[PDB]
């Protein structure tokens, strides 16, 4: 009954959408969506891991910025500095209050 | 008709019956109750304006 946003990766594709999606309970892609309707518009580009962005949505555009690093502890942040470049400036034109991320599952667990 | 205003640069498609009221319509059209995007009537013997 609104419009939606959203973002997936392929390991070699972004893939951003704001059509006016119906969406599951537990929304996962098995290792897987795609259903559209009145779409306005699409994009596309190109534990030891840590990734860090930022989310901001005002006037119109919404705003990105990343940064990733090797990092070397269990299961905690680490201590240091590290500043996030700028990555995107989407133009989107919607209204968000609620957010929810995406995994990736090996069977298809549809609750 | 629009429950609260706009920001800069926020469009809007929404196709739901609006409520004037107080008593809920769930998909009724009725009164106090009705459709907000109304039409224009361009016909071309209007004055300018
Ligand atoms: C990854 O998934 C998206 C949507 O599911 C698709 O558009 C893209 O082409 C995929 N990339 C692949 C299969 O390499
Ligand atoms: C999709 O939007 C268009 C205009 O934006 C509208 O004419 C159409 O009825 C919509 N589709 C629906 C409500 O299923």
Same mark, same amino acid.
């Given at each position: 009954?609104?419009?939606?946003?959203?973002?997936?990766?392929?390991?070699?594709?972004?893939?951003?959408?704001? +059509?006016?999606? $119906?969406?599951?309970?537990? @929304?996962?892609?098995?290792?897987?969506? #795609? #259903?559209?309707? /009145? +779409?306005?518009?699409?994009?596309?580009?190109?534990?030891?891991? !840590?990734?860090?962005?930022?989310?901001?949505?005002?006037?119109?555009?919404?705003?990105?910025?990343?940064?990733?690093? &090797?990092?070397?502890?269990?299961?905690?942040? &680490? $201590?240091?500095? %590290?500043? *996030?470049? &700028? =990555?995107?400036? !989407?133009?989107?034109?919607? /209204?968000?209050?609620?957010?929810?991320? =995406?995994?990736? *599952?090996?069977?298809?667990? !549809?609750? | 008709?629009?429950? %609260?205003? !706009?920001?800069?640069?926020?469009?809007?498609?929404?196709?739901?019956?609006?409520?004037?009221? #107080?008593? @809920? +319509?769930?998909?009724?059209?009725?009164? /106090?109750?009705?459709?907000? =995007? $109304? #039409?224009?009537?361009?016909? @071309?013997?209007?004055?300018?304006?």
């Amino acid at each position: 009954k609104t419009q939606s946003l959203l973002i997936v990766n392929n390991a070699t594709n972004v893939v951003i959408k704001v +059509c006016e999606f $119906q969406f599951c309970n537990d @929304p996962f892609l098995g290792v897987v969506y #795609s #259903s559209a309707n /009145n +779409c306005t518009f699409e994009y596309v580009s190109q534990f030891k891991n !840590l990734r860090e962005f930022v989310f901001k949505n005002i006037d119109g555009y919404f705003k990105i910025y990343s940064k990733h690093t &090797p990092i070397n502890l269990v299961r905690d942040l &680490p $201590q240091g500095f %590290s500043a *996030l470049e &700028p =990555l995107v400036d !989407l133009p989107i034109g919607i /209204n968000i209050t609620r957010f929810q991320t =995406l995994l990736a *599952l090996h069977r298809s667990y !549809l609750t | 008709f629009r429950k %609260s205003n !706009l920001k800069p640069f926020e469009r809007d498609i929404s196709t739901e019956i609006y409520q004037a009221g #107080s008593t @809920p +319509c769930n998909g009724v059209e009725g009164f /106090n109750c009705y459709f907000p =995007l $109304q #039409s224009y009537g361009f016909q @071309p013997t209007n004055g300018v304006g």
